[PDB]
Nucleic acid binder design. Sequence first.
DNA 1: ACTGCTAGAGATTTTCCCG
DNA 2: CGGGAAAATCTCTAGCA
DNA 3: ACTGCTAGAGATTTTCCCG
DNA 4: CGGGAAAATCTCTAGCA
Lengths: 242, 261, 261, 242, 66, 66, 47, 47
Amino acid sequence: LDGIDKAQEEHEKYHSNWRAMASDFNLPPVVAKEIVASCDKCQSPGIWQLDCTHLEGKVILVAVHVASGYIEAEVIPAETGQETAYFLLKLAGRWPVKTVHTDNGSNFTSTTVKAACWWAGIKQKFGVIESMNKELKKIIGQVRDQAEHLKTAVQMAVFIHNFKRKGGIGGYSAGERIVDIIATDIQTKELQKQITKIQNFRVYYRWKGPAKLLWKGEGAVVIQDNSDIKVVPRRKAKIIRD
Amino acid sequence: FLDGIDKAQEEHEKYHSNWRAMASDFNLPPVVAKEIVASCDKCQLKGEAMHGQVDCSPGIWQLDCTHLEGKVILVAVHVASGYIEAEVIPAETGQETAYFLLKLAGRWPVKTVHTDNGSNFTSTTVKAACWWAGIKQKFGIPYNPQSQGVIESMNKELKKIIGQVRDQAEHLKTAVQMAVFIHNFKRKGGIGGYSAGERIVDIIATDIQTKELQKQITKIQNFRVYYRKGPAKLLWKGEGAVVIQDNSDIKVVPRRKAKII
Amino acid sequence: FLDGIDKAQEEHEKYHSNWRAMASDFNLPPVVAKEIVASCDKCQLKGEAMHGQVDCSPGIWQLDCTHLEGKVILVAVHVASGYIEAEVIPAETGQETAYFLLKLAGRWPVKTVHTDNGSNFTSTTVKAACWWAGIKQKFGIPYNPQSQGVIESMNKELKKIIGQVRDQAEHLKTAVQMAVFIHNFKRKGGIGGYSAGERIVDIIATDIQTKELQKQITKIQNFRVYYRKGPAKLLWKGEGAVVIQDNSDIKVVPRRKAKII
Amino acid sequence: LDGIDKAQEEHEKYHSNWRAMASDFNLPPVVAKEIVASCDKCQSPGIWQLDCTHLEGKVILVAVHVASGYIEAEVIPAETGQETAYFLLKLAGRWPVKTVHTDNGSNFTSTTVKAACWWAGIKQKFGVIESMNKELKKIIGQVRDQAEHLKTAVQMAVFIHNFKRKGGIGGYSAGERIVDIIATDIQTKELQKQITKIQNFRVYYRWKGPAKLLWKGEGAVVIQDNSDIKVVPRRKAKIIRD
Amino acid sequence: ELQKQITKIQNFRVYYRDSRDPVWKGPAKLLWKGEGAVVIQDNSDIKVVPRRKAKIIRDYGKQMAG
Amino acid sequence: ELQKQITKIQNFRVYYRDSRDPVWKGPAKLLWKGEGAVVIQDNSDIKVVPRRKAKIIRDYGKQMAG
Amino acid sequence: NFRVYYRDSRDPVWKGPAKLLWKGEGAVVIQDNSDIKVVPRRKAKII
Amino acid sequence: NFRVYYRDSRDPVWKGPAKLLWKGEGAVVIQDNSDIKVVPRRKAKII
DNA sequence: ACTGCTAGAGATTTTCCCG
DNA sequence: CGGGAAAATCTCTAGCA
DNA sequence: ACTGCTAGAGATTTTCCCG
DNA sequence: CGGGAAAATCTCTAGCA
Ligand SMILES: C[C@@H]1CCO[C@H]2Cn3cc(C(=O)NCc4ccc(F)cc4F)c(=O)c(O)c3C(=O)N12
Ligand SMILES: C[C@@H]1CCO[C@H]2Cn3cc(C(=O)NCc4ccc(F)cc4F)c(=O)c(O)c3C(=O)N12
Ligand SMILES: [Mg+2]
Ligand SMILES: [Zn+2]
Ligand SMILES: [Zn+2]
């Protein structure tokens, strides 16, 4: 409430994103979002990639979360549409899958995979998959002796890649990265939902012209008028729906 | 009561009358009648009326095999979140249960699996699958599905969803995957208004974030506290109350009669 | 919400999401999401969470046939008191059920018998036995033993007692009679600290005494009451409140705005 | 409390039983019992009778409550100890049976009947049964045509005798009489239990010598001293157990 | 006459149940009995209870205690 | 430094259960997490809750409402 | 007018909707395709 | 010392008495004739 | 030495919203 | 501060087989 | 137009009993 | 009026199959 001006100044100085401002100054995220959206000089997690690898005569079907390097893979009996659609429906049930990238192969452009995408709500679009292929094959070659079949080896390989190999800026593994990115997406969806809810409300304060509503606090009401954010007492402003 | 008690045991040896009947018919105090009933082996036929409370740690998963349309569905659930994984398998065999377990341990951080004493879960092939993935096996008390209440309740929700979508799939495996999707991402409610997927993401993300934060706090905040004792390690302070750990025993003491060094 | 509702039905037609999920994903009021869920036939899969309440009139008896050691035990119970009658019979046949019913109706005043829809109770021989004794037959909703909760619970206490005394009898009929004796006269507790026999005696004795007393009171106390209406028949007066019966409708009115003639 | 003297006078005049005094004057039944027990010039429901009747070649085994005329009867296959003991155990389970009168017949003096009496707590002792035999046979002869077997006729006869034929001073049937008599016995047993409980208590009031305790009210304590009943406040008397 | 009858009918205790409460309510005081409804007094409150929900007794244990 | 970390760890909500109550208690405020026990604050009261009885979240719905 | 979805007898499949004819305390009488049935209120939902 | 009567496994006959070795929250460990068993506290009575 | 639970339906209490 | 409506909490049940 | 209940085990609140 | 102990009330569960 009191730090809106400090936030506006810090953004005009450093062009910071709304998350830091809501964290540093203790502002409702909607207000910081409006701060970053008020300057015109200041202006992925559902994106999986699908490919098929051949090894020892069986077909391995790999799925990679681009943002995180997280790998979903399993051995399928035949490079067919049935199994591809089954795999993709499974994946859509495990993680939130919003769009899948494929190599326009016969098994990816079938009618069954398309129907599975339609039901699961996935968008289909026809180089990270190749590097992840190479790394997964490397790990399988490491760990093959510890199993008898190839499906078990593949799963042990996926476990090792997802949770035992760490790297990047912070030294996190792919599982931690995926959890973090999906959590950030949950935050973004919730913030968008709340903004969409409040955007259909108009506020008349002190009477003055209608203004966009930003926050409905327990001791204040935050409003934006003429590209300027002002704080008014709840008893000094009436909120109506339009 | 020496005449009244001796007749009460003689009557109890025949009819096994409860404490009330023997108190009314022989003029006995309630404690004496209750003692007479409590010494009869043939009258101890009821356990105590409570329920236990299953483990809900973030790494706890409950697995169970359920049947539908002659097929076997191996179901897992994250207890803290309710996020479920399921798969139609041709046989309740330790081989395919171990396969399901290795897949699960590769997709999510699984620290401990809780199962009943089915032959597929108690198999030596699952033991090797748990040992390689570093999973701890916690078997329940035999013939007590209450110890697996979370997964058994999940066997009901999953079946209830499958019947809702069974006419949108030719095969039962497709319907099982549709049901998993629907439960995990289209049913909201619970301890955060979340769905199961949102909730599970919250639990692991919170676990890592809080572990890192508390590691930093303990690295910085380093104090010893004397109260009433030894130099207990400081844990938290504020609002006129101090929480400390004295010899691996967490207790709460007020700010008075407690000094921080 | 015209764009938000049309997408919600389209998503519900696939996943059958509950009202919360459709309110969060499409920005809907709770009433609109609940309306969308309430119009889907495939989502009405749960009844309301309550229980009914069986008839406990003084003339109500519940009968049921239970099995033990390959023999058939026909059990009856007085619902208001818990006094039970039982008998080992060679077959679940309307003939012997009618015999048991005629014996029971001859020993106690039986006004109505409540049973499930077993073949022995729904038999035409029991109907004649009930018609001759002036008994009314009340059958429960099929496959709902909850409608016979009193007798079904009595099937458990009776079996529990039999196992306590089964080693004092060579035959099972002797043990059944011992158990009936023990339940009826050696187990105290309930709504008067009574046993089942004492309690049943209290219910019928009270029924006759109160019927006679109220007959006398109504014969003497003859008044008409006007309140707020017609000349309602007076029932009771005192403590600043009047109870009357206006056109077969008992209601309580205060002493004010009420005159007794 | 206040009517103890009126009760004492009414008893010295009319020699009334304690029940009327407790009902007319509103006295605890213990106090009225002590009133009737203080004068020396003023000084059955568990008694069943058993006999066997022969009719149409089968043996009917009848039980009669002497105090009430209530009849328990059923046809048995053989005049044997097994069936007699079964019948008597059944009866002891239905009603409170305390002593049974028999005609010293072979089936009544067996070891099985004696053991059944020992288990059920019944005392065995070896003209109402004959009159009840005659009445039951009369009713069976009336109602025989309405049945095919004889056991069913006998049971219909028992129902008619117990609940459809009425007589006596008040015009009550045998069932109402038995219920009433058993209820009066319950009252008597409860009163005896309470008297036995209170008889082991001594009261010291105002201190005076020990006195027998009669009632422990909410505003008073009733005591009997030197064959004279007096009322003292609870705070003016201490009760001890001896 | 009538008053004795009324204070006699009021000596009977009534255990009853409401249409949605599974637990039995404590002993009330019978004011009026009918073929289908009984009128009681529970804790200075007058309730009308159907005959199928009420278990009227007299408690001979209590008549003899006081 | 440390204060920011402490008021960050206190932003996490904790649902917990007592050793004999089957119902989940509302969102508390996390004060300290440990390997086997968590220290919370429910309605101006400091409780110690084992790790197996607690569900700690952050409610992203709420972080974004206020 | 009320729609009633019920669970009639030893059958896990829910049926309905049916007309409400009588709502009692604990049980309800409905009409499902010219067939009169009595179902407890634990096994019915009324809308 | 405590006597424990229990109901072990898919068996309606109650057994006991057995020595109490460990009372947990929801389950108990006992010793019945040199045989160690774990029984929930719904299926045991301790005296 | 381990452990009933989950989600929905109806009822009842809280909170908020404009006077 | 006062009602009404909507939201939140509470209570309770089947099914897991 | 019909309907869960009963008795026991442990916990918690009430009542009483002597100061 | 104040604790302690005993009694009364409350809460909750298996089994009825
Ligand atoms: C042969 C394995 C090992 C040995 O035991 C059997 C028997 N069993 C029985 C049920 C069952 O009927 N559950 C209903 C239920 C009842 C109470 C409760 F608290 C929880 C509940 F889920 C199962 O679900 C189940 O998986 C098994 C099983 O797996 N096995
Ligand atoms: C062939 C007749 C007629 C058609 O129905 C069957 C089936 N049935 C089932 C049970 C039973 O499982 N009771 C456990 C229980 C469950 C719930 C509840 F509320 C009360 C309870 F007693 C019986 O006792 C019983 O007598 C019968 C029976 O007689 N029949
Ligand atoms: Mg039956
Ligand atoms: Zn015993
Ligand atoms: Zn639907």
